[PDB]
């Protein structure tokens, strides 16, 4: 029906900095656009309604603007505090959300191999674990390869939450076998391509 | 001030229904529209509907038409809102949110009730090891667990610098999986002791697992 578009994503910033997020609406239905923030562990919490008026006991730092079809929020002087996620509304319709990252310089991923143990073997199932440690920005892929071939949808992924003291990422890619099909194969390893990388990188191990 | 405390967390097998329950307080109950959003784990806000609590109206997204119901209790200034027949999808904290005049925008909002849909029961995890080999990583795999949360420590906390314990992933099977990792040098692999501690209070769950090279 009416679909709001935030852009961009993502922001990555340094605390001090201007933030200036964007939600674009296909139809303009209306003049009237609020914004909400919501921090980890927390319920949303609305700042900005129709388009510039800031809420009861919001910072000033926060202002919002436009009309029609465009809308836009400012943070002037980003904060430690202020790094969260924040949404547009409008009626019954919600923006994607943009979430506000601390900016650093690009850190390449240390990556890790770690075979099944030998007591969850015992069990009847094999986790491989691809450990990608300390790395920035967030985008990163990782390729599991079994015998040289490349598998899909059998691995899931986690990712932190960025490091209050170094604003980098650390995530886990596990791969997860039966027994049997965990031993009819002999090579397994895991594909990292990350930004900070010149080339891929390959952790792999012989069962 | 004006509060709005809903009912305490919920969980529900699939096909159920839950009756949430949002009370409030300092203000005239049934003088300002009562909206209800929910957030499906680690994804965006979603719009359910609303109830005028002045005469009971009510007004449906399209897709839970049918499926819920919006009411309220002016005589205890309590709104409710139930849904029936829950799927996976319906996993989420679900917040009341209150219109400051009569805009459409949610002013006040109350603290969220989650609500687990799950087929599962209790269960307490296997913990494995993930052995290591200036700088070596090595960990401890918490697998198949359920409700969430687990916690994990090493060296019964005395471990803390470059701990990273990912969050949890729910798995096809209903059961939870996570690591916890950490980054030690390699000249200690050899004579340090490094044991994860893990922690899952449903199932009185308290593993202490050794992970050697």
């Known amino acids: ?207 | 001030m004006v509060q709005l405390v809903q009912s305490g967390t919920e969980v529900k097998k699939p096909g159920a229904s839950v009756k949430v329950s949002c009370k409030a307080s300092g203000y005239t109950f049934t003088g300002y529209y009562m909206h209800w959003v929910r957030q499906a784990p680690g994804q965006g806000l979603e719009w359910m509907g609303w109830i005028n609590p002045n005469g009971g109206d009510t007004n449906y997204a399209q897709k839970f038409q049918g499926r819920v119901t919006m009411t309220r209790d002016t005589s205890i200034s309590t709104a409710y809102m139930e849904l029936s027949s829950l799927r996976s999808e319906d996993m989420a904290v679900y917040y009341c949110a209150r219109e400051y005049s009569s805009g459409w925008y949610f002013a006040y909002w109350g603290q969220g009730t989650l609500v687990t849909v799950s087929s599962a029961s209790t269960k307490g995890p296997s913990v494995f090891p993930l052995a290591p080999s200036g700088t070596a990583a090595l960990g401890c795999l918490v697998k198949d667990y359920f409700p969430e949360p687990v916690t994990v420590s090493w060296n019964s906390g005395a471990l803390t610098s470059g701990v990273h314990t990912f969050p949890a992933v729910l798995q096809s099977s209903g059961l939870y999986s996570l690591s916890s990792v950490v980054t030690v040098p390699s000249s200690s692999l050899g004579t340090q002791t490094y044991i994860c501690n893990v922690n899952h209070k449903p199932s009185n769950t308290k593993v202490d697992k050794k992970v050697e090279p």
């Open chain 1, 1 to 207: 029906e009416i679909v709001l578009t935030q852009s961009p994503a993502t922001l990555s910033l340094s605390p001090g900095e201007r933030a200036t997020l964007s939600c674009r609406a296909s139809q303009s239905v209306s003049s009237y656009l609020a914004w909400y923030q919501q921090k980890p562990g927390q319920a949303p919490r609305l700042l900005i309604y129709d388009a510039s008026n800031r809420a009861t006991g919001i910072p000033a730092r926060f202002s919002g603007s436009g009309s029609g079809t465009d809308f836009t929020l400012t943070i002037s002087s980003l904060e430690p505090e202020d790094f969260a996620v924040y949404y547009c509304q409008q009626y019954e319709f919600f923006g994607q959300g943009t979430k506000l990252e601390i900016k650093r310089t690009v850190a390449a991923p240390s990556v890790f191999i770690f075979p099944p143990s030998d007591e969850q073997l015992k069990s009847g199932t094999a986790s491989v674990v691809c450990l990608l440690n300390n790395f920035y920005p967030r985008e990163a892929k990782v390729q599991w390869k079994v015998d040289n071939a490349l598998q899909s949808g059998n691995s899931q992924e986690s990712v932190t939450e960025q490091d209050s003291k170094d604003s980098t990422y650390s995530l886990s890619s596990t791969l997860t076998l039966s027994k049997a099909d965990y031993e009819k194969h002999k090579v397994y390893a895991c594909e990292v391509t990350h930004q900070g990388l010149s080339s891929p990188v390959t952790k792999s191990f012989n069962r």
